[PDB]
Amino acid sequence: NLYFQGMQIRLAFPNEIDQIMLLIEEARAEIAKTGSDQWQKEDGYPNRNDIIDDILNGYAWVGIEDGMLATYAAVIDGHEEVYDAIYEGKWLHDNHRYLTFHRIAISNQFRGRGLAQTFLQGLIEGHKGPDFRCDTHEKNVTMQHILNKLGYQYCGKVPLDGVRLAYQKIKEK
C-alpha cells in the first residue's frame, strides 16, 4: 500500500485477474503495432496462468489511477539465470540478488508514459533494493525510454527469447 504522486501502488489481489488481463491484452495489441514479437508467441505469454502465478508468488503489483487499475508489473527479488549470460557488455556489478521487473503493462487509456514512470518510480521508491534490473525487446523503444528516464543504465544484451537489452539502476537512497 504505497502512494506515489497520487497513484496507489500495491500488490494485486486475486480478484483483479480479469482487469489485469484486459490491460495485458491492450498492451499486447499495442506492441504488435510496432512489429515486435514481444508477447506475440503461440504460448500466449504473458497469459492468465502467468499472471495468477505472479499473484500466488507475491510478484504482482498494480498501479491504481483515479480508482482504475492502470498499470501492472511483476517484481521478483532474487536471481535471473539468463542475466548471467550478459554479453556485448556487463552489469554494473555482479551481485547475485537483485530486484527485477517483468511483464510491465502500462495503460494507454492512461497514455503518455506519465503513468509508467510514476508507477515504476513508485516501485523503486517503495523497495529497498538497491539493485534494480530490467530487460526489454530491441524494438521496445518506449520501454527503453522509460528506463533511461528512470536512471537505468544500459548494460548489454542477454539471450532471452532471442535477444533482450539489459538495464540496471542502483538506487541512491
Side-chain angles (χ1 to χ4, degrees), residues 2-40 43-89 91-108 110 112-127 129-152 154-171:
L2 318 179
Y3 280 91
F4 185 72
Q5 311 183 342
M7 184 179 299
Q8 179 188 175
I9 299 174
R10 56 162 172 80
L11 291 170
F13 296 100
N15 78 357
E16 295 181 303
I17 181 64
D18 292 338
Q19 290 165 78
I20 294 165
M21 287 322 295
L22 289 162
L23 171 53
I24 289 290
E25 294 300 335
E26 289 167 16
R28 190 193 318 278
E30 291 305 290
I31 295 171
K33 292 176 174 174
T34 70
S36 178
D37 65 2
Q38 185 172 25
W39 299 8
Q40 310 303 313
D43 65 7
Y45 172 86
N47 59 38
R48 177 171 292 263
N49 292 334
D50 294 305
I51 300 313
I52 289 169
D53 283 348
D54 284 346
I55 296 170
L56 294 174
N57 292 323
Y59 302 163
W61 286 79
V62 292
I64 312 304
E65 181 79 354
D66 305 342
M68 319 239 51
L69 202 155
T71 61
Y72 178 85
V75 179
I76 303 179
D77 181 6
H79 190 76
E80 284 297 338
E81 305 299 317
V82 170
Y83 284 4
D84 299 329
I86 191 162
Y87 68 102
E88 288 180 40
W91 294 107
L92 301 178
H93 70 65
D94 203 19
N95 198 280
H96 185 88
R97 175 186 186 178
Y98 41 79
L99 289 168
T100 311
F101 299 166
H102 303 276
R103 292 175 288 284
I104 298 166
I106 306 299
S107 179
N108 49 51
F110 296 95
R113 287 196 202 83
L115 257 69
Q117 286 189 50
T118 297
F119 177 52
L120 301 178
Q121 191 174 355
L123 291 173
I124 292 162
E125 301 265 12
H127 284 84
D131 185 352
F132 293 83
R133 302 192 190 188
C134 195
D135 62 83
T136 197
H137 196 282
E138 288 176 307
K139 294 182 186 175
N140 204 331
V141 170
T142 299
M143 188 58 48
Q144 293 164 35
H145 181 80
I146 292 162
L147 295 173
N148 178 285
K149 284 286 293 310
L150 290 165
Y152 290 70
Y154 174 72
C155 286
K157 287 168 182 172
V158 294
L160 180 57
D161 195 40
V163 187
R164 292 291 184 275
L165 302 180
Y167 289 83
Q168 181 176 16
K169 174 179 180 73
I170 306 302
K171 188 180 185 189

Short mmCIF file of all heavy atoms in Angstrom, two decimals, residues 26-67, unseen atoms left out:
data_model
loop_
_atom_site.label_atom_id
_atom_site.label_comp_id
_atom_site.label_asym_id
_atom_site.label_seq_id
_atom_site.Cartn_x
_atom_site.Cartn_y
_atom_site.Cartn_z
N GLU A 26 -4.48 -5.29 -23.96
CA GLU A 26 -4.35 -3.97 -24.58
C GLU A 26 -2.88 -3.72 -24.92
O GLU A 26 -2.53 -3.30 -26.04
CB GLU A 26 -4.96 -2.86 -23.70
CG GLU A 26 -6.51 -2.89 -23.63
CD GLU A 26 -7.07 -1.99 -22.51
OE1 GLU A 26 -6.33 -1.13 -22.00
OE2 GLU A 26 -8.26 -2.16 -22.14
N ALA A 27 -2.02 -3.99 -23.95
CA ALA A 27 -0.62 -3.80 -24.16
C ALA A 27 -0.05 -4.70 -25.26
O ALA A 27 0.78 -4.27 -26.07
CB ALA A 27 0.14 -4.00 -22.85
N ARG A 28 -0.50 -5.95 -25.29
CA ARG A 28 -0.06 -6.89 -26.29
C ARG A 28 -0.41 -6.35 -27.68
O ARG A 28 0.40 -6.48 -28.62
CB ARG A 28 -0.71 -8.26 -26.07
CG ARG A 28 -0.12 -9.36 -26.93
CD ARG A 28 -0.97 -10.62 -26.94
NE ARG A 28 -1.51 -11.02 -25.65
CZ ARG A 28 -0.86 -11.72 -24.71
NH1 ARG A 28 0.41 -12.05 -24.87
NH2 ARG A 28 -1.49 -12.06 -23.59
N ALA A 29 -1.60 -5.77 -27.85
CA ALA A 29 -2.03 -5.25 -29.15
C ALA A 29 -1.19 -4.03 -29.53
O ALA A 29 -0.93 -3.79 -30.71
CB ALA A 29 -3.48 -4.90 -29.11
N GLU A 30 -0.84 -3.23 -28.55
CA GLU A 30 -0.03 -2.05 -28.84
C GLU A 30 1.37 -2.48 -29.26
O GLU A 30 1.92 -1.96 -30.25
CB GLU A 30 -0.03 -1.04 -27.68
CG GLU A 30 -1.38 -0.36 -27.48
CD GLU A 30 -1.93 0.34 -28.73
OE1 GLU A 30 -1.35 1.37 -29.11
OE2 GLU A 30 -2.94 -0.11 -29.34
N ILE A 31 1.95 -3.44 -28.56
CA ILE A 31 3.23 -3.98 -29.01
C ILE A 31 3.19 -4.50 -30.45
O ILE A 31 4.15 -4.31 -31.24
CB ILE A 31 3.72 -5.12 -28.09
CG1 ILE A 31 4.02 -4.57 -26.70
CG2 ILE A 31 4.97 -5.80 -28.69
CD1 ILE A 31 4.28 -5.61 -25.66
N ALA A 32 2.09 -5.16 -30.84
CA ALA A 32 2.03 -5.78 -32.15
C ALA A 32 2.14 -4.73 -33.24
O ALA A 32 2.73 -4.97 -34.30
CB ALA A 32 0.74 -6.56 -32.30
N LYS A 33 1.59 -3.55 -32.99
CA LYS A 33 1.65 -2.45 -33.96
C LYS A 33 3.08 -2.01 -34.29
O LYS A 33 3.32 -1.43 -35.35
CB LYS A 33 0.82 -1.26 -33.48
CG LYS A 33 -0.66 -1.53 -33.47
CD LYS A 33 -1.43 -0.37 -32.89
CE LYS A 33 -2.93 -0.60 -33.02
NZ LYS A 33 -3.69 0.48 -32.33
N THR A 34 4.03 -2.31 -33.41
CA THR A 34 5.44 -1.95 -33.62
C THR A 34 6.22 -2.96 -34.46
O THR A 34 7.38 -2.71 -34.82
CB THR A 34 6.17 -1.76 -32.29
OG1 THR A 34 6.34 -3.03 -31.64
CG2 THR A 34 5.44 -0.82 -31.38
N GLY A 35 5.62 -4.10 -34.76
CA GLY A 35 6.30 -5.16 -35.50
C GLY A 35 7.14 -6.09 -34.64
O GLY A 35 7.74 -7.05 -35.13
N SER A 36 7.17 -5.82 -33.34
CA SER A 36 7.87 -6.67 -32.39
C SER A 36 7.15 -7.98 -32.17
O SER A 36 5.93 -8.05 -32.20
CB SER A 36 7.95 -5.92 -31.07
OG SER A 36 8.59 -6.70 -30.07
N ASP A 37 7.92 -9.03 -31.86
CA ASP A 37 7.33 -10.29 -31.48
C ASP A 37 7.18 -10.44 -29.97
O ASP A 37 6.71 -11.47 -29.50
CB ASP A 37 8.09 -11.48 -32.10
CG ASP A 37 9.52 -11.62 -31.60
OD1 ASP A 37 9.97 -10.84 -30.75
OD2 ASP A 37 10.19 -12.55 -32.10
N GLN A 38 7.53 -9.40 -29.20
CA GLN A 38 7.36 -9.43 -27.76
C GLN A 38 5.89 -9.68 -27.41
O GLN A 38 5.02 -8.95 -27.85
CB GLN A 38 7.83 -8.13 -27.13
CG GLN A 38 7.78 -8.18 -25.62
CD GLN A 38 8.41 -6.98 -24.95
OE1 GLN A 38 8.50 -5.90 -25.55
NE2 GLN A 38 8.85 -7.15 -23.70
N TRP A 39 5.64 -10.74 -26.66
CA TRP A 39 4.31 -11.15 -26.19
C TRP A 39 3.40 -11.68 -27.31
O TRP A 39 2.20 -11.82 -27.10
CB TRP A 39 3.58 -10.05 -25.42
CG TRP A 39 4.23 -9.56 -24.17
CD1 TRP A 39 5.47 -9.86 -23.69
CD2 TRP A 39 3.66 -8.62 -23.26
NE1 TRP A 39 5.68 -9.18 -22.51
CE2 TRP A 39 4.58 -8.43 -22.22
CE3 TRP A 39 2.44 -7.95 -23.22
CZ2 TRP A 39 4.34 -7.54 -21.16
CZ3 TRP A 39 2.19 -7.10 -22.14
CH2 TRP A 39 3.14 -6.90 -21.14
N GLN A 40 3.96 -11.96 -28.48
CA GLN A 40 3.16 -12.32 -29.66
C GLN A 40 3.27 -13.79 -30.00
O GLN A 40 2.83 -14.19 -31.08
CB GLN A 40 3.62 -11.52 -30.88
CG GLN A 40 3.72 -10.02 -30.68
CD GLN A 40 2.43 -9.38 -30.21
OE1 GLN A 40 1.36 -9.65 -30.78
NE2 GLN A 40 2.53 -8.45 -29.25
N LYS A 41 3.81 -14.59 -29.11
CA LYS A 41 4.12 -16.00 -29.42
C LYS A 41 2.94 -16.92 -29.15
O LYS A 41 1.99 -16.56 -28.45
CB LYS A 41 5.30 -16.49 -28.58
CG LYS A 41 6.54 -15.61 -28.63
CD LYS A 41 6.99 -15.34 -30.03
N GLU A 42 3.01 -18.13 -29.71
CA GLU A 42 1.92 -19.09 -29.60
C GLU A 42 1.56 -19.47 -28.16
O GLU A 42 0.40 -19.76 -27.87
CB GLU A 42 2.23 -20.35 -30.42
N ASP A 43 2.55 -19.44 -27.27
CA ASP A 43 2.33 -19.74 -25.85
C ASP A 43 1.43 -18.74 -25.12
O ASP A 43 1.05 -18.99 -23.97
CB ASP A 43 3.67 -19.86 -25.11
CG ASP A 43 4.45 -18.55 -25.08
OD1 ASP A 43 3.91 -17.51 -25.50
OD2 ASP A 43 5.60 -18.57 -24.62
N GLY A 44 1.13 -17.60 -25.74
CA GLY A 44 0.26 -16.58 -25.15
C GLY A 44 0.90 -15.77 -24.03
O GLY A 44 0.23 -14.97 -23.37
N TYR A 45 2.20 -15.96 -23.80
CA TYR A 45 2.88 -15.26 -22.73
C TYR A 45 2.80 -13.75 -22.93
O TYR A 45 3.04 -13.28 -24.03
CB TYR A 45 4.36 -15.65 -22.69
CG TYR A 45 5.14 -14.82 -21.71
CD1 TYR A 45 5.20 -15.18 -20.37
CD2 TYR A 45 5.78 -13.63 -22.10
CE1 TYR A 45 5.88 -14.42 -19.47
CE2 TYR A 45 6.47 -12.86 -21.20
CZ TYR A 45 6.52 -13.26 -19.87
OH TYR A 45 7.22 -12.50 -19.00
N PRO A 46 2.47 -12.99 -21.87
CA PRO A 46 2.01 -13.44 -20.56
C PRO A 46 0.54 -13.80 -20.61
O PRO A 46 -0.28 -12.99 -21.07
CB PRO A 46 2.26 -12.23 -19.66
CG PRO A 46 2.66 -11.13 -20.54
CD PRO A 46 2.57 -11.53 -21.92
N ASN A 47 0.19 -14.99 -20.16
CA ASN A 47 -1.20 -15.41 -20.18
C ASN A 47 -1.79 -15.41 -18.76
O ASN A 47 -1.13 -15.04 -17.80
CB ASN A 47 -1.35 -16.77 -20.85
CG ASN A 47 -0.55 -17.86 -20.19
OD1 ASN A 47 -0.43 -17.91 -18.97
ND2 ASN A 47 0.00 -18.76 -21.02
N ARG A 48 -3.05 -15.82 -18.64
CA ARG A 48 -3.75 -15.76 -17.37
C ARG A 48 -3.00 -16.56 -16.31
O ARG A 48 -2.88 -16.14 -15.18
CB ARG A 48 -5.17 -16.30 -17.57
CG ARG A 48 -6.06 -16.38 -16.33
CD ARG A 48 -7.50 -16.73 -16.72
NE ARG A 48 -8.10 -15.61 -17.44
CZ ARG A 48 -8.88 -14.67 -16.91
NH1 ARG A 48 -9.22 -14.72 -15.63
NH2 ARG A 48 -9.32 -13.68 -17.66
N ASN A 49 -2.51 -17.73 -16.70
CA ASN A 49 -1.73 -18.54 -15.77
C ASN A 49 -0.45 -17.87 -15.32
O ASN A 49 -0.03 -18.02 -14.16
CB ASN A 49 -1.42 -19.92 -16.35
CG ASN A 49 -2.66 -20.79 -16.49
OD1 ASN A 49 -3.66 -20.63 -15.78
ND2 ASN A 49 -2.61 -21.71 -17.44
N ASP A 50 0.22 -17.17 -16.22
CA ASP A 50 1.41 -16.41 -15.83
C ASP A 50 1.07 -15.37 -14.76
O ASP A 50 1.78 -15.22 -13.77
CB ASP A 50 2.05 -15.70 -17.02
CG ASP A 50 2.61 -16.67 -18.04
OD1 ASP A 50 3.43 -17.53 -17.64
OD2 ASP A 50 2.25 -16.59 -19.24
N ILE A 51 -0.03 -14.66 -14.96
CA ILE A 51 -0.41 -13.62 -14.01
C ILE A 51 -0.90 -14.21 -12.70
O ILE A 51 -0.57 -13.70 -11.61
CB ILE A 51 -1.45 -12.69 -14.64
CG1 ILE A 51 -0.88 -12.02 -15.90
CG2 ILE A 51 -1.90 -11.63 -13.64
CD1 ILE A 51 0.49 -11.44 -15.77
N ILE A 52 -1.67 -15.30 -12.73
CA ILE A 52 -2.09 -15.94 -11.48
C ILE A 52 -0.84 -16.40 -10.71
O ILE A 52 -0.78 -16.23 -9.50
CB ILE A 52 -3.06 -17.13 -11.73
CG1 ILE A 52 -4.42 -16.59 -12.18
CG2 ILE A 52 -3.22 -17.98 -10.45
CD1 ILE A 52 -5.39 -17.63 -12.71
N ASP A 53 0.14 -16.94 -11.43
CA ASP A 53 1.39 -17.34 -10.78
C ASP A 53 2.08 -16.14 -10.12
O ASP A 53 2.56 -16.23 -9.00
CB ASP A 53 2.33 -18.08 -11.74
CG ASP A 53 1.91 -19.53 -11.99
OD1 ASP A 53 1.03 -20.04 -11.26
OD2 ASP A 53 2.49 -20.18 -12.89
N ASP A 54 2.09 -14.99 -10.79
CA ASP A 54 2.62 -13.77 -10.20
C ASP A 54 1.90 -13.38 -8.92
O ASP A 54 2.52 -12.97 -7.97
CB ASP A 54 2.53 -12.58 -11.19
CG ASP A 54 3.57 -12.61 -12.27
OD1 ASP A 54 4.55 -13.37 -12.19
OD2 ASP A 54 3.40 -11.82 -13.23
N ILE A 55 0.59 -13.52 -8.89
CA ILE A 55 -0.18 -13.22 -7.69
C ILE A 55 0.10 -14.25 -6.58
O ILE A 55 0.31 -13.87 -5.43
CB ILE A 55 -1.69 -13.11 -8.01
CG1 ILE A 55 -1.94 -11.92 -8.95
CG2 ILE A 55 -2.50 -12.92 -6.71
CD1 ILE A 55 -3.35 -11.86 -9.53
N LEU A 56 0.13 -15.54 -6.93
CA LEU A 56 0.45 -16.58 -5.96
C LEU A 56 1.83 -16.39 -5.36
O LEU A 56 2.02 -16.58 -4.15
CB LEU A 56 0.36 -17.97 -6.62
CG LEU A 56 -1.04 -18.41 -7.07
CD1 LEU A 56 -0.95 -19.74 -7.83
CD2 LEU A 56 -1.91 -18.58 -5.86
N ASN A 57 2.79 -16.03 -6.22
CA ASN A 57 4.19 -15.86 -5.79
C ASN A 57 4.46 -14.52 -5.09
O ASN A 57 5.57 -14.31 -4.59
CB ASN A 57 5.16 -16.02 -6.98
CG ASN A 57 5.20 -17.44 -7.53
OD1 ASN A 57 5.13 -18.41 -6.77
ND2 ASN A 57 5.37 -17.58 -8.84
N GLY A 58 3.49 -13.60 -5.08
CA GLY A 58 3.69 -12.31 -4.42
C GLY A 58 4.48 -11.32 -5.27
O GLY A 58 5.08 -10.35 -4.75
N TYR A 59 4.51 -11.56 -6.58
CA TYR A 59 5.24 -10.73 -7.53
C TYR A 59 4.38 -9.61 -8.11
O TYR A 59 4.92 -8.63 -8.59
CB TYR A 59 5.71 -11.56 -8.71
CG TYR A 59 6.60 -12.73 -8.42
CD1 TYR A 59 6.76 -13.71 -9.40
CD2 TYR A 59 7.36 -12.82 -7.27
CE1 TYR A 59 7.62 -14.78 -9.22
CE2 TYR A 59 8.23 -13.91 -7.07
CZ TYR A 59 8.35 -14.86 -8.05
OH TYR A 59 9.22 -15.93 -7.84
N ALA A 60 3.05 -9.79 -8.12
CA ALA A 60 2.18 -8.94 -8.91
C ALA A 60 1.87 -7.63 -8.23
O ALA A 60 1.26 -7.61 -7.14
CB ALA A 60 0.88 -9.66 -9.20
N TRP A 61 2.28 -6.53 -8.85
CA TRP A 61 1.97 -5.19 -8.37
C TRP A 61 1.12 -4.47 -9.39
O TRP A 61 1.28 -4.65 -10.60
CB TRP A 61 3.25 -4.39 -8.19
CG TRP A 61 4.03 -4.78 -6.98
CD1 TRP A 61 4.84 -5.86 -6.87
CD2 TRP A 61 4.08 -4.11 -5.73
NE1 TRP A 61 5.40 -5.91 -5.62
CE2 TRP A 61 4.93 -4.84 -4.88
CE3 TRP A 61 3.47 -2.96 -5.22
CZ2 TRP A 61 5.20 -4.43 -3.57
CZ3 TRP A 61 3.73 -2.58 -3.93
CH2 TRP A 61 4.61 -3.29 -3.13
N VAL A 62 0.24 -3.61 -8.88
CA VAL A 62 -0.59 -2.76 -9.75
C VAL A 62 -0.51 -1.31 -9.34
O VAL A 62 -0.20 -0.99 -8.18
CB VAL A 62 -2.07 -3.22 -9.77
CG1 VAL A 62 -2.17 -4.56 -10.46
CG2 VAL A 62 -2.67 -3.29 -8.35
N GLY A 63 -0.82 -0.44 -10.28
CA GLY A 63 -0.97 0.98 -10.00
C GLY A 63 -2.40 1.38 -10.32
O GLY A 63 -2.92 1.05 -11.39
N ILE A 64 -3.02 2.10 -9.40
CA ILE A 64 -4.41 2.50 -9.48
C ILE A 64 -4.41 4.02 -9.63
O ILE A 64 -3.83 4.73 -8.80
CB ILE A 64 -5.20 2.09 -8.21
CG1 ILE A 64 -4.95 0.64 -7.81
CG2 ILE A 64 -6.70 2.39 -8.35
CD1 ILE A 64 -5.25 -0.36 -8.87
N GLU A 65 -5.04 4.49 -10.70
CA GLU A 65 -5.11 5.91 -11.05
C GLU A 65 -6.59 6.24 -11.20
O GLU A 65 -7.30 5.57 -11.95
CB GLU A 65 -4.36 6.16 -12.36
CG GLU A 65 -4.33 7.62 -12.85
CD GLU A 65 -3.31 8.49 -12.13
OE1 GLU A 65 -2.69 8.01 -11.15
OE2 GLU A 65 -3.12 9.65 -12.56
N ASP A 66 -7.06 7.23 -10.45
CA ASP A 66 -8.48 7.62 -10.47
C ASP A 66 -9.41 6.42 -10.23
O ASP A 66 -10.43 6.27 -10.90
CB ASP A 66 -8.81 8.32 -11.79
CG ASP A 66 -7.89 9.51 -12.09
OD1 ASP A 66 -7.23 10.04 -11.16
OD2 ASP A 66 -7.84 9.92 -13.27
N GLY A 67 -9.04 5.55 -9.30
CA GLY A 67 -9.86 4.39 -8.97
C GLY A 67 -9.84 3.23 -9.97
O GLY A 67 -10.57 2.26 -9.80
#
